């Protein structure tokens, strides 16, 4: 599994510059004509730079590429939140046909505004109770940074099993969202007095409650 050498992670503040290196050898980057690609979660890879320095159609000027021997560099200026993605370099290895990629670099754009989570807890729907299932859905949105812990409580006591939580993922507005599920039987849902979804984030803990008596 031969892969060009890229830094795992890089960072930069809004408006500032960042550089991403691509170290290889003389058979790859040395021969020149390195290319760069952007991969945003939930979208197909986009070609940014080719031929070391040439920009692809529709690519902003703030994206630029260079090369010094066996190491190429992607430079991104006037950084913005939308620039957070994985960036891969690539080149031909002694053959215009065969190509190798780099290990990939995740870009973290610093200085972005913080925001508290908005939590909504949904009880099991009637449709689901009819299939003899009961899932509690805790949706969390519009927070930054993308780091939360979720805890489930049943009658003011902790839940011992049945929880599955997604890793925070970016929304279209650049804030983060996350989801949590508590899978129960229709009996448990009716046995207890209330269920809570607790979302902790940057010193606040937002708790949303549901009870079958309200339904």
């Amino acid at each position: 599994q031969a892969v060009l050498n890229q830094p795992s992670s890089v960072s930069g503040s809004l408006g500032q510059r960042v550089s991403i290196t691509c170290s290889g050898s003389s058979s790859n980057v040395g021969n020149g004509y390195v290319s760069w690609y952007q991969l945003i979660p939930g979208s197909a890879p986009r070609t940014l730079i080719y031929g070391d320095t040439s920009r692809a159609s529709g690519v902003p000027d703030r994206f630029s590429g260079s090369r010094s021997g066996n190491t190429a560099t992607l430079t991104i200026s006037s950084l913005q939140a939308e620039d957070e993605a994985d960036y891969f370099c690539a080149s031909a290895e002694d053959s215009s046909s065969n190509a190798v990629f780099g290990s990939g670099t995740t870009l973290t754009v610093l200085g972005q505004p913080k925001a508290a989570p908005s939590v909504t807890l949904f009880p099991p729907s009637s449709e689901e109770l009819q299939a003899n299932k009961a899932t509690l859905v805790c949706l969390i949105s519009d927070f930054y940074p993308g780091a939360v812990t979720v805890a489930w409580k049943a009658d003011s006591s902790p839940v011992k099993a049945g929880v599955e939580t997604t890793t925070p993922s970016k929304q279209s507005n650049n804030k983060y969202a996350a989801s949590s599920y508590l899978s129960l039987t229709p009996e448990q849902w009716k046995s207890h007095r209330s269920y809570s979804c607790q979302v902790t984030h940057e010193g606040s803990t937002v708790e949303k409650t549901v009870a079958p008596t309200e339904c």
Partner: protein, 271 residues
């Protein structure tokens, strides 16, 4: 150019994965069409491409299991990966590769440009001639111009990609349940509502709202893999609380792996 991937979202372990790519808006007999994949948590991995006529080219580390054919008639290229494992579960992208080997003329070390070469040297041109001093024995040192080779490669356009899962588990369409807004679950002028897409396999699932006419405040979450081996996800949209009774909200769930589409109307609760 449009690059559409087609094929199974699911292949059983140690069997063959067959994918097809339909190119729309290009001839298939010049532009190189290649395959690139990305396994979860791993880097882009080159697989192969087919050039003019059928000059196939693969990854040295995967050429034994890879096979790429081409049919200019139907404007389609195919990929085949044999004896697949969980490591071959990945998004497979159809792409148009631009292969090119630029050539440049040069002289050896110590030789310079000159017009002294005889015709018997067969250099194929008056300009393709080199000279490097006068040797004490051989005399005027003549030599033809050496031709270098600059390799050029990059991906011009990317298909949307097709997600392939290697598993013995069978396909299962989704069960879509409403996440209805409630008198207490509102946030003033806005109300969160959504759809729970439960117990499907394999990935992926996409969700729109009102056939795409509604996009503001929509977010479909990543899926969770449950102990049952089935996936579930939710899609939420933020709407005006005052429109719950009058405006209709329908989530359009697409699960291509099972050729299933579900439209579920989300009614407001009386609570």
């Amino acid at each position: 150019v449009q690059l559409r991937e087609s094929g199974p979202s699911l292949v059983k372990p140690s069997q063959t994965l067959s994918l097809t790519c339909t190119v729309s808006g290009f001839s298939l007999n010049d532009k190189a069409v290649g395959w690139v994949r990305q396994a979860p948590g791993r880097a882009l991995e080159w697989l192969g491409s087919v050039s003019t006529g059928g000059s196939t080219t693969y990854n040295p580390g995967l050429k034994p299991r890879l096979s790429i054919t081409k049919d200019n008639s139907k404007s389609q290229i195919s990929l085949t990966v044999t004896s697949v494992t969980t490591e071959d579960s990945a998004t497979y992208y159809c792409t148009t590769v631009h292969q090119t080997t630029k050539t440049t003329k040069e002289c050896p070390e110590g030789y310079n440009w000159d017009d002294g070469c005889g015709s018997e040297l067969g250099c194929g041109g008056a300009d393709c001639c080199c000279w490097g001093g006068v040797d004490e024995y051989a005399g005027d040192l003549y030599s033809c111009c050496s031709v270098a080779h600059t390799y050029e490669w990059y991906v011009d356009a990317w298909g949307q990609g097709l997600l392939v899962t290697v598993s013995s588990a069978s396909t299962k369409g989704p069960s879509v349940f409403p996440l209805a807004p409630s008198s207490k679950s509102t946030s003033g002028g806005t109300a969160a509502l959504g759809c729970l897409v439960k117990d499907y396999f394999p990935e992926p699932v996409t969700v729109s709202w009102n056939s795409g006419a509604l996009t503001s405040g929509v977010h479909t979450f990543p899926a969770v893999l449950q102990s049952s081996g089935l996936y579930s996800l939710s899609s939420v949209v933020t709407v005006p609380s005052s429109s719950l009774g009058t405006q209709t909200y329908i989530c359009n769930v697409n699960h291509k792996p099972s050729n299933t589409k579900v439209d579920k109307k989300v009614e407001p609760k009386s609570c």
